[PDB]
Structures are given as C-alpha cells and as structure tokens.
Motif scaffolding. Structure first.
Motif, mmCIF file in Angstrom:
data_model
loop_
_atom_site.group_PDB
_atom_site.id
_atom_site.type_symbol
_atom_site.label_atom_id
_atom_site.label_comp_id
_atom_site.label_asym_id
_atom_site.label_seq_id
_atom_site.Cartn_x
_atom_site.Cartn_y
_atom_site.Cartn_z
ATOM 1 N N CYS A 15 0.827 -1.201 0.000
ATOM 2 C CA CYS A 15 0.000 0.000 0.000
ATOM 3 C C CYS A 15 0.866 1.257 0.000
ATOM 4 C CB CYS A 15 -0.927 0.007 1.217
ATOM 5 S SG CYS A 15 -1.771 1.597 1.500
ATOM 6 N N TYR A 17 -0.742 4.566 0.734
ATOM 7 C CA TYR A 17 -1.327 5.432 1.750
ATOM 8 C C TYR A 17 -0.488 5.422 3.024
ATOM 9 C CZ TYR A 17 -5.171 8.086 3.806
ATOM 10 O OH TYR A 17 -5.943 9.078 4.364
ATOM 11 N N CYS A 18 -0.354 4.246 3.627
ATOM 12 C CA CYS A 18 0.423 4.098 4.852
ATOM 13 C C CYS A 18 1.798 3.503 4.557
ATOM 14 C CB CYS A 18 -0.324 3.212 5.850
ATOM 15 S SG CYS A 18 -0.675 1.533 5.236
ATOM 16 N N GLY A 19 1.821 2.466 3.724
ATOM 17 C CA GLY A 19 3.075 1.825 3.374
ATOM 18 C C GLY A 19 3.166 0.406 3.899
ATOM 19 N N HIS A 31 -7.293 -4.336 3.268
ATOM 20 C CA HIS A 31 -6.570 -3.411 4.134
ATOM 21 C C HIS A 31 -6.953 -1.967 3.827
ATOM 22 C CE1 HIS A 31 -3.209 -0.885 5.520
ATOM 23 N NE2 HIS A 31 -3.122 -0.494 4.261
ATOM 24 N N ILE A 34 -9.251 0.434 5.857
ATOM 25 C CA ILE A 34 -8.908 1.329 6.954
ATOM 26 C C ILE A 34 -8.786 2.770 6.470
ATOM 27 C CG2 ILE A 34 -7.650 -0.544 8.063
ATOM 28 C CD1 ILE A 34 -5.067 1.169 7.373
ATOM 29 N N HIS A 35 -8.393 2.935 5.211
ATOM 30 C CA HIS A 35 -8.240 4.262 4.626
ATOM 31 C C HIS A 35 -9.586 4.810 4.160
ATOM 32 C CE1 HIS A 35 -4.041 3.525 4.986
ATOM 33 N NE2 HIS A 35 -3.976 2.664 3.986
HETATM 34 ZN ZN LIG Z 1 -2.509 1.447 3.743
#
Ligand SMILES: [Zn+2]
Length: 46
Positions: A15, A17-19, A31, A34-35
């Motif tokens: 991902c 967004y977060c990594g 996952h 969550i975003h």
């Molecule tokens: Zn993410």
C-alpha cells in the motif's frame, strides 16, 4: 515494552497510503478499507 515482528518479507502488493506490505492482492484490498471509512454498519474500527 515488547517488540519484534520479523517475518513479513517484501511483497509485490504494498500500500502507498500508509506503506504496508501484502503478499496477496486480497490482503491489500481488504486493508485499504482502513483508509476508506464510510457507512460503518457496526462498532468496528481500530
Ligand atoms: Zn494502507
């Protein structure tokens, strides 16, 4: 103060967004949730 989660290797589906790293696309998609939080039907968020 526990720590240490060595095991997950570099996956092709990571991902941005977060990594986070995911071996299977399914894991990556679920996952991303969550975003994207909308119309939360039920007490579940952390
Ligand atoms: Zn993410």
């Amino acid at each position: 103060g526990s720590s240490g989660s060595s095991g997950s290797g570099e996956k092709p589906y990571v991902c941005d967004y977060c990594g986070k790293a995911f071996g299977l696309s399914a894991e990556l998609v679920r996952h991303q949730r969550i975003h994207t939080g909308e119309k939360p039907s039920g007490p579940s968020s952390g």
